[PDB]
Amino acid sequence: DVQLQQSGPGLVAPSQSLSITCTVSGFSLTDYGVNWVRQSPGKGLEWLGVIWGDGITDYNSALKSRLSVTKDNSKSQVFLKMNSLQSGDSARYYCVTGLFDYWGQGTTLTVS
Amino acid sequence: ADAVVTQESALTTSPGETVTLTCRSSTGAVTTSNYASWVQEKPDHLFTGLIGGTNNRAPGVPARFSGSLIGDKAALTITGAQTEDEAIYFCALWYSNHWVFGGGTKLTVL
């Protein structure tokens, strides 16, 4: 069994940003990648990005400029930062495994 | 820009019956390189992964859940549904450097 725990201040306030930390258990960040996803009320899910074991990162082509995904392999952590937030960013943010098999409890973000 | 992933809006079944959820890609036939994956959303935004990479069950997932590719589309099949299987099903395809989620299929188990 593997677990993913989300934390971090998150924040709020417009013009500023969101910051989330995802701690994994059951496997090392050196071997496999972690995804980030969000779902806004009434709307579907949308992939934000993934950070592979070797450090390479892939982003959502339309949000690329406003987000950063980094990780500390030794502390088994992955960080998500999204900036220049707007009302439309309000949603629930989740960190997930390589093929979306395991999920984190999610974090709710109310912007503005 | 990128592709559109399409799923049926609603589907209905009953205990013991069999049902098939599909996933279409706007770029053409779905393939093994799209690494089709399926996740189940239950009330309370409870997410669980079911199938990953076309036909692999995410450990701990009931064997009644299967996946494969049929006629240009990805498919999730529940052989012998149960009442708890009532939820929204999301499909996700991979396009070389990113994932695209389908709109979801609400499944009703009368």
């Binding site: 990648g33 074991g53 390479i56 390589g98 | 990953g52 990479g53 069950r57 450990p59």
Partner: peptide, 12 residues
Amino acid sequence: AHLENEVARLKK
């Protein structure tokens, strides 16, 4: 590939 690697993981 990264995916073929996640696949290897799911199969165990």
